[PDB]
Design an enzyme around this catalytic site. Structure first.
Site, PDB file in Angstrom:
ATOM      1  N   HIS B 458       1.929  -8.595 -11.099  1.00 53.58           N
ATOM      2  CA  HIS B 458       1.681  -7.886  -9.851  1.00 53.58           C
ATOM      3  C   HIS B 458       0.962  -6.563 -10.112  1.00 53.58           C
ATOM      4  O   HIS B 458       1.263  -5.887 -11.085  1.00 53.58           O
ATOM      5  CB  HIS B 458       3.004  -7.639  -9.127  1.00 53.58           C
ATOM      6  CG  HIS B 458       2.858  -7.001  -7.781  1.00 53.58           C
ATOM      7  ND1 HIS B 458       2.299  -7.654  -6.702  1.00 53.58           N
ATOM      8  CD2 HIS B 458       3.219  -5.776  -7.332  1.00 53.58           C
ATOM      9  CE1 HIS B 458       2.315  -6.855  -5.651  1.00 53.58           C
ATOM     10  NE2 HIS B 458       2.871  -5.710  -6.005  1.00 53.58           N
TER      11      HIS B 458
HETATM   12  C1  LIG Z   1       2.974   4.752 -10.991  1.00 49.27           C
HETATM   13  C2  LIG Z   1       3.668   3.420 -11.125  1.00 49.27           C
HETATM   14  C3  LIG Z   1       2.918   2.254 -11.236  1.00 49.27           C
HETATM   15  C4  LIG Z   1       3.548   1.018 -11.359  1.00 49.27           C
HETATM   16  N1  LIG Z   1       2.785  -0.097 -11.469  1.00 49.27           N
HETATM   17  C5  LIG Z   1       3.365  -1.312 -11.586  1.00 49.27           C
HETATM   18  C6  LIG Z   1       2.577  -2.560 -11.703  1.00 49.27           C
HETATM   19  O1  LIG Z   1       1.327  -2.526 -11.693  1.00 49.27           O
HETATM   20  N2  LIG Z   1       3.239  -3.717 -11.817  1.00 49.27           N
HETATM   21  C7  LIG Z   1       4.581  -3.792 -11.829  1.00 49.27           C
HETATM   22  O2  LIG Z   1       5.112  -4.923 -11.939  1.00 49.27           O
HETATM   23  N3  LIG Z   1       5.369  -2.695 -11.729  1.00 49.27           N
HETATM   24  C8  LIG Z   1       4.838  -1.457 -11.605  1.00 49.27           C
HETATM   25  N4  LIG Z   1       5.659  -0.325 -11.497  1.00 49.27           N
HETATM   26  C9  LIG Z   1       7.103  -0.544 -11.543  1.00 49.27           C
HETATM   27  C10 LIG Z   1       7.615  -0.988 -10.191  1.00 49.27           C
HETATM   28  O3  LIG Z   1       7.148  -0.103  -9.164  1.00 49.27           O
HETATM   29  C11 LIG Z   1       9.128  -0.976 -10.274  1.00 49.27           C
HETATM   30  O4  LIG Z   1       9.545  -1.641 -11.471  1.00 49.27           O
HETATM   31  C12 LIG Z   1       9.743  -1.660  -9.073  1.00 49.27           C
HETATM   32  O5  LIG Z   1       9.333  -0.982  -7.879  1.00 49.27           O
HETATM   33  C13 LIG Z   1      11.255  -1.636  -9.196  1.00 49.27           C
HETATM   34  O6  LIG Z   1      11.803  -2.073  -7.963  1.00 49.27           O
HETATM   35  P1  LIG Z   1      13.359  -1.848  -7.664  1.00 49.27           P
HETATM   36  O7  LIG Z   1      13.784  -2.817  -6.587  1.00 49.27           O
HETATM   37  O8  LIG Z   1      14.115  -1.759  -8.965  1.00 49.27           O
HETATM   38  O9  LIG Z   1      13.399  -0.364  -7.039  1.00 49.27           O
HETATM   39  P2  LIG Z   1      12.225   0.309  -6.167  1.00 49.27           P
HETATM   40  O10 LIG Z   1      11.161  -0.704  -5.819  1.00 49.27           O
HETATM   41  O11 LIG Z   1      11.842   1.613  -6.822  1.00 49.27           O
HETATM   42  O12 LIG Z   1      13.032   0.648  -4.828  1.00 49.27           O
HETATM   43  C14 LIG Z   1      14.104   1.584  -4.857  1.00 49.27           C
HETATM   44  C15 LIG Z   1      14.283   2.137  -3.456  1.00 49.27           C
HETATM   45  O13 LIG Z   1      15.590   2.683  -3.316  1.00 49.27           O
HETATM   46  C16 LIG Z   1      15.507   3.863  -2.520  1.00 49.27           C
HETATM   47  N5  LIG Z   1      16.676   4.706  -2.848  1.00 49.27           N
HETATM   48  C17 LIG Z   1      16.881   5.447  -3.953  1.00 49.27           C
HETATM   49  N6  LIG Z   1      18.095   6.059  -3.890  1.00 49.27           N
HETATM   50  C18 LIG Z   1      18.677   5.699  -2.732  1.00 49.27           C
HETATM   51  C19 LIG Z   1      19.952   5.968  -2.034  1.00 49.27           C
HETATM   52  N7  LIG Z   1      20.888   6.780  -2.573  1.00 49.27           N
HETATM   53  N8  LIG Z   1      20.151   5.382  -0.835  1.00 49.27           N
HETATM   54  C20 LIG Z   1      19.240   4.569  -0.270  1.00 49.27           C
HETATM   55  N9  LIG Z   1      18.065   4.280  -0.852  1.00 49.27           N
HETATM   56  C21 LIG Z   1      17.734   4.805  -2.053  1.00 49.27           C
HETATM   57  C22 LIG Z   1      14.143   4.467  -2.808  1.00 49.27           C
HETATM   58  O14 LIG Z   1      13.660   5.189  -1.673  1.00 49.27           O
HETATM   59  C23 LIG Z   1      13.292   3.249  -3.127  1.00 49.27           C
HETATM   60  O15 LIG Z   1      12.496   2.846  -2.007  1.00 49.27           O
HETATM   61  C24 LIG Z   1       5.042   0.944 -11.372  1.00 49.27           C
HETATM   62  C25 LIG Z   1       5.784   2.116 -11.258  1.00 49.27           C
HETATM   63  C26 LIG Z   1       5.151   3.344 -11.134  1.00 49.27           C
HETATM   64  C27 LIG Z   1       6.007   4.574 -11.014  1.00 49.27           C
HETATM   65  F1  LIG Z   2       1.227  -5.824  -1.129  1.00 46.31           F
HETATM   66  C1  LIG Z   2       2.339  -6.373  -0.819  1.00 46.31           C
HETATM   67  F2  LIG Z   2       2.374  -7.478  -1.467  1.00 46.31           F
HETATM   68  F3  LIG Z   2       3.269  -5.633  -1.309  1.00 46.31           F
HETATM   69  C2  LIG Z   2       2.494  -6.574   0.646  1.00 46.31           C
HETATM   70  N1  LIG Z   2       3.830  -7.051   0.988  1.00 46.31           N
HETATM   71  C3  LIG Z   2       4.080  -8.434   0.616  1.00 46.31           C
HETATM   72  C4  LIG Z   2       4.956  -9.135   1.563  1.00 46.31           C
HETATM   73  C5  LIG Z   2       5.680  -9.619   2.378  1.00 46.31           C
HETATM   74  C6  LIG Z   2       6.528 -10.158   3.351  1.00 46.31           C
HETATM   75  N2  LIG Z   2       6.351  -9.777   4.638  1.00 46.31           N
HETATM   76  C7  LIG Z   2       7.239 -10.346   5.408  1.00 46.31           C
HETATM   77  C8  LIG Z   2       7.301 -10.154   6.860  1.00 46.31           C
HETATM   78  C9  LIG Z   2       6.506  -9.189   7.455  1.00 46.31           C
HETATM   79  C10 LIG Z   2       6.533  -8.982   8.817  1.00 46.31           C
HETATM   80  C11 LIG Z   2       7.373  -9.760   9.586  1.00 46.31           C
HETATM   81  C12 LIG Z   2       8.197 -10.738   9.014  1.00 46.31           C
HETATM   82  C13 LIG Z   2       8.923 -11.338  10.080  1.00 46.31           C
HETATM   83  C14 LIG Z   2       8.524 -10.734  11.220  1.00 46.31           C
HETATM   84  N3  LIG Z   2       7.579  -9.783  10.949  1.00 46.31           N
HETATM   85  C15 LIG Z   2       6.858  -8.964  11.923  1.00 46.31           C
HETATM   86  C16 LIG Z   2       6.275  -9.802  13.048  1.00 46.31           C
HETATM   87  C17 LIG Z   2       4.827 -10.254  12.894  1.00 46.31           C
HETATM   88  C18 LIG Z   2       4.307 -10.936  14.156  1.00 46.31           C
HETATM   89  C19 LIG Z   2       4.710 -12.388  14.263  1.00 46.31           C
HETATM   90  N4  LIG Z   2       4.229 -13.124  13.106  1.00 46.31           N
HETATM   91  C20 LIG Z   2       4.885 -12.647  11.905  1.00 46.31           C
HETATM   92  C21 LIG Z   2       4.621 -11.169  11.692  1.00 46.31           C
HETATM   93  C22 LIG Z   2       8.152 -10.935   7.638  1.00 46.31           C
HETATM   94  S1  LIG Z   2       8.334 -11.367   4.584  1.00 46.31           S
HETATM   95  C23 LIG Z   2       7.548 -11.035   3.127  1.00 46.31           C
HETATM   96  C24 LIG Z   2       7.957 -11.782   1.984  1.00 46.31           C
HETATM   97  N5  LIG Z   2       8.791 -10.881   1.154  1.00 46.31           N
HETATM   98  C25 LIG Z   2      10.224 -10.792   1.465  1.00 46.31           C
HETATM   99  C26 LIG Z   2      10.582  -9.335   1.257  1.00 46.31           C
HETATM  100  C27 LIG Z   2       9.580  -8.825   0.426  1.00 46.31           C
HETATM  101  C28 LIG Z   2       8.351  -9.502   0.936  1.00 46.31           C
HETATM  102  C29 LIG Z   2       8.816 -12.978   2.430  1.00 46.31           C
HETATM  103  C30 LIG Z   2       8.960 -14.081   1.403  1.00 46.31           C
HETATM  104  C31 LIG Z   2       7.637 -14.538   0.948  1.00 46.31           C
HETATM  105  C32 LIG Z   2       6.938 -13.425   0.262  1.00 46.31           C
HETATM  106  C33 LIG Z   2       6.715 -12.259   1.206  1.00 46.31           C
END
Ligand SMILES: Cc1cc2nc3c(=O)[nH]c(=O)nc-3n(C[C@H](O)[C@H](O)[C@H](O)COP(=O)(O)OP(=O)(O)OC[C@H]3O[C@@H](n4cnc5c(N)ncnc54)[C@H](O)[C@@H]3O)c2cc1C
Ligand SMILES: FC(F)(F)CNCC#Cc1nc(-c2ccc3c(ccn3CCC3CCNCC3)c2)sc1C1(N2CCCC2)CCCCC1
Ligand SMILES: Cc1cc2nc3c(=O)[nH]c(=O)nc-3n(C[C@H](O)[C@H](O)[C@H](O)COP(=O)(O)OP(=O)(O)OC[C@H]3O[C@@H](n4cnc5c(N)ncnc54)[C@H](O)[C@@H]3O)c2cc1C
Ligand SMILES: FC(F)(F)CNCC#Cc1nc(-c2ccc3c(ccn3CCC3CCNCC3)c2)sc1C1(N2CCCC2)CCCCC1
EC number: 1.8.1.12
Lengths: 487, 485
Positions: B458
């Site tokens: 990704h």
């Molecule tokens: C600059 C950069 C570039 C990157 N590029 C890549 C890439 O090209 N490919 C790749 O695979 N990975 C990449 N990564 C890594 C990737 O972004 C992470 O590994 C991934 O997002 C981890 O997802 P996660 O579900 O562990 O947590 P995250 O996706 O970080 O989500 C955590 C969420 O929890 C929320 N949160 C934190 N604390 C609390 C709390 N107390 N209560 C409620 N919510 C909270 C935050 O707001 C955040 O939205 C990159 C990271 C960085 C920093």
């Molecule tokens: F670049 C990114 F790749 F990060 C962009 N985001 C990727 C994505 C997505 C995504 N969006 C959803 C999505 C987005 C909008 C939605 C609904 C259901 C309703 N809505 C809004 C309504 C509109 C109008 C009616 N038609 C559907 C969309 C669902 S569900 C969903 C999936 N993921 C699950 C969570 C992480 C992403 C679901 C499983 C297959 C892969 C993608």
């Protein structure tokens, strides 16, 4: 409010778990995050680090940076234009990036509004008891309670956070978080660290810097991108240098002070100094455990900062799980997604599933980019008696015409020479991230080197080089590198 | 005498000749009509691919892609004097010519420095079952230069552009001449729905002078017959989006010269069109006429190809044929593979045959195509239960680049009885690079589960191939339906 699953963190892993639990198994899910869209003050938001201040915005800005090469390289193919009129507008890049990220934020908000049994809660989540997640106004435990979410299952998925060294003047430095919102592109910038974040941002700043600018990357040790194939590590160093980036190995900032004009005066441990407009720290990311009050419930951490989990993402506390960067293993978005999906299948679909953390394909979006999957040769050499390395390096033809002759494509294949099983593939050059994806499928099928060189090639491509290597370039026997097998 | 005489120093001929001389120390002769690229014969030492095929085509599409890069850069903050932009066709051709010539010279050095491997300039034909005569021209009555005695003869003369029998056909070019046009045509008509017509339409579209227009016409309803139909329709849209006019259900009936040298095209429908170049790209046919195959009785297929068995053997003992002359898959890597297998079988008692199934290929249109295996309508005739996985999306960059129309399409066709992947079809930037390793996957009989249980990379377009777990529709006993019965 009683839920089957409460997710703290609406990121890559958290959202996958929530969506799957709600839509595949009809469970009542609550997801907690601190913002509904990207940006300060908390940067990450609904969608996670990847969407808001990670993979997505990074990819868009690297794509923008690549046009510095495209514009120059077009001349070799007959394209003519006033080169002195070329300017790069940083504000337009940021504004366009903000629109694209915001479109994703808005999409995820629509997902919650339209999906039954999948509810979003704005605030800071923490553990009050084994079955209660408390949502507060701020990360401070003294802030007001917004909701108490009764949970049969709790998922910790708060990601990671930039590590900032404790040097005098660290307050004058930024991390990748702030880099995504700089009001102007720095004329002179120091990116600290040898990892993919520092390397990727170095290419971005190098393309958008104003006239008379210079990008410097420093790293405490001798060779950047530790953990990647050594040949690629050395080549990207050369190709970064060839594009104007100064690489400072065996150097580490000791302090930072302000000049009268606001620029930063950096002093390294070696005594050297450097004046820059921005100092970006990208020395690592650490699990985001400080706000969860894990001690209230007794969730254990590993000897490293990560939440300790077994192969099914279970913590030491029943019905509390953890996935993603907070577990401090492979900090990649697709791994967090896979862990979240596997967790929900196990807990709610009586379909036990565990994520495979080996043979995971990944990429680095340097210019040119890296694509890799599996073991590097020095790791395979310690796990296998006979290891063979197939290597090919060449400047593609288009780049002799383009004038970027330093852009050599590198293709490496590491095998267990006993049976030919491919242990790792490592690529440097245009298209490498797209090439390596299906290589990941090959490695999951335990492909052998002969499966590659007996596949008919696609011509003309860089990828076909992977099917043109049938004789090893050198070997590792019992850990010793040698050009030919003994006897 | 010679162990092997190869007629045609192309993709298959050079692989066969080189292997036999270096791997088995055999004495090899190779015949070709030219030592370097260009008119009058266009193909030369190195084959169609090197001189007027894959290699120069790729360079010229690369050059053409900069029209999109220059425009799309604006969405990322880049600005420059747009009115100063010119696409210098002459510089492109000059750069292409030197790249091809360097390859010609390289093969020239190979022959000079490899013992047992010799090159003969001229036109080769079959005098008898053991004699290849080299003449000064394709005319069988032209002066003789050499008579090569051969224990084994390899026919590897490739293919040649097909031209329809319409009045004024002489005023039309083929892909051969397109590589050497002195000026970029302001108005061009490419005739045919195949990959050559589509690829050159994008080249001409990028380098055309101001006020130009590229028109592509095809005699039936949908271009790129033989490719996935979803991709056929989407490519049509994205070509139109970039300013190419696609004329379906139209076919030229006659061509005449206007007073300015341009061409007046009259279609069968009565429509007319004036263009500066008419490029015929309606097909390629095996190049058999000059070989005098009737002298020894080499049998041809009803479609004109040299008939061969699985080991490239003709009906005449010790005469073989590989590459486009066999009229199977007209791809350079296939010809190379057939050449190497033949030499291994003949000179190494290790019988090897080329597997012509599950071969990955690409079309370097803008956007490009990558494909491997069966399309769904073929699979439906061959399997009782077929599942189709389909996904379309806009790559991240094209949300701000200004090219929203550039949708990426990913299709997977499986045998739903066991999930075996039968075909993969891709449309969008990166597709040629993605599909190569997919070819390895199909060799390993990968199932759809092997794809969606692999962790994605990704953000990439390729990870979409690992994100499709549920069929979009099925074919059961050849009948298309959304859900299974
Ligand atoms: C600059 C950069 C570039 C990157 N590029 C890549 C890439 O090209 N490919 C790749 O695979 N990975 C990449 N990564 C890594 C990737 O972004 C992470 O590994 C991934 O997002 C981890 O997802 P996660 O579900 O562990 O947590 P995250 O996706 O970080 O989500 C955590 C969420 O929890 C929320 N949160 C934190 N604390 C609390 C709390 N107390 N209560 C409620 N919510 C909270 C935050 O707001 C955040 O939205 C990159 C990271 C960085 C920093
Ligand atoms: F670049 C990114 F790749 F990060 C962009 N985001 C990727 C994505 C997505 C995504 N969006 C959803 C999505 C987005 C909008 C939605 C609904 C259901 C309703 N809505 C809004 C309504 C509109 C109008 C009616 N038609 C559907 C969309 C669902 S569900 C969903 C999936 N993921 C699950 C969570 C992480 C992403 C679901 C499983 C297959 C892969 C993608
Ligand atoms: C415009 C175009 C683009 C293409 N793009 C691609 C692509 O991207 N990928 C791909 O895989 N394939 C592509 N092809 C197909 C590829 O070029 C051919 O499949 C491949 O070159 C076949 O090689 P071969 O060994 O059959 O013969 P060729 O490589 O065609 O070589 C035949 C040689 O024999 C010589 N010859 C002919 N008659 C005689 C005679 N009587 N005496 C002596 N010598 C003779 C010719 O001069 C020629 O050099 C393309 C073809 C064209 C026309
Ligand atoms: F389309 C391409 F651009 F890809 C064409 N080039 C591909 C190639 C090649 C190739 N060149 C050879 C080559 C080229 C030059 C050579 C020698 C042996 C001696 N020389 C002369 C070298 C001198 C050195 C001094 N400077 C002038 C050239 C060999 S042998 C060879 C291989 N095939 C042989 C026939 C088809 C391709 C060998 C087996 C692996 C694939 C490539």
């Amino acid at each position: 409010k009683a839920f089957d699953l409460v997710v703290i963190g609406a990121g890559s892993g958290g959202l996958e778990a929530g969506w799957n639990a709600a839509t595949l198994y009809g469970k009542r899910v609550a997801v907690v995050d601190v913002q509904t869209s990207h940006g300060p003050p908390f940067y990450a938001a609904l969608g996670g680090t990847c969407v808001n201040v990670g993979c997505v915005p990074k990819k868009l800005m690297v794509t923008g940076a690549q046009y510095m090469d495209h514009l120059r390289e077009s001349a070799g193919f007959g394209w003519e234009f006033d080169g002195s009129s070329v300017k790069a507008n940083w504000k337009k890049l940021i504004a366009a990036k903000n629109e694209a990220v915001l479109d994703i934020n808005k999409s995820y908000e629509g997902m919650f509004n339209d999906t039954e049994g999948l509810d979003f809660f704005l605030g800071w989540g923490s553990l009050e008891s084994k079955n209660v997640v408390v949502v507060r106004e701020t990360a401070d435990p003294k802030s007001a309670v917004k909701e108490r979410l009764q949970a049969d299952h709790i998922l910790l998925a708060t990601g990671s956070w930039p590590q900032m060294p404790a040097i005098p003047g660290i307050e004058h430095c930024i991390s990748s978080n702030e880099a995504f919102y700089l009001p102007e592109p720095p004329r002179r910038v120091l990116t600290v660290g040898g990892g993919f974040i520092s390397v990727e941002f170095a290419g971005i700043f190098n393309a958008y810097k104003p006239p008379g600018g210079k990008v410097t990357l420093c790293y405490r040790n001798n060779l950047i991108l530790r953990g990647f194939d050594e040949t690629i590590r050395e080549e990207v160093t050369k190709q970064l240098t060839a594009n104007g980036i100064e690489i400072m190995t065996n150097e580490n900032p000791a302090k930072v002070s302000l000049n009268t004009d606001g620029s930063k005066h950096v002093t390294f441990e070696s005594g050297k100094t450097l004046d820059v407009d921005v100092v970006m720290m990208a020395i690592g990311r650490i699990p985001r455990t400080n706000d969860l009050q894990l001690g209230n419930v007794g969730v254990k951490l590993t000897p490293k900062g990560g939440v300790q989990v077994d192969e099914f993402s279970r913590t030491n506390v029943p019905n509390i799980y953890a996935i993603g960067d907070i577990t401090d293993r492979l900090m990649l978005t697709p791994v967090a997604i896979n862990e979240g999906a596997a967790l929900v299948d196990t807990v709610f679909g009586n379909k036990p599933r565990k994520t495979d953390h080996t043979r995971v394909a990944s990429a680095v979006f340097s210019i040119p980019p890296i694509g890799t999957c599996g073991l590097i040769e020095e790791v395979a050499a310690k796990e296998f008696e006979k290891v063979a390395v197939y290597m090919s390096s060449f400047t593609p033809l288009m780049h002799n015409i383009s004038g970027s002759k330093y852009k050599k494509f590198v293709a490496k294949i590491v095998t267990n020479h006993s049976d030919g099983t491919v242990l790792g593939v490592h690529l440097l050059g245009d298209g490498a991230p797209e090439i390596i994806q299906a290589v990941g499928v090959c490695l999951r099928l335990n492909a052998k080197i002969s499966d590659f060189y007996n596949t008919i090639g696609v011509h003309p491509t860089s990828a076909e080089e992977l099917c043109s290597m049938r004789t090893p370039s050198y070997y590792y026997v019992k850990g010793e590198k040698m050009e030919k097998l003994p006897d």
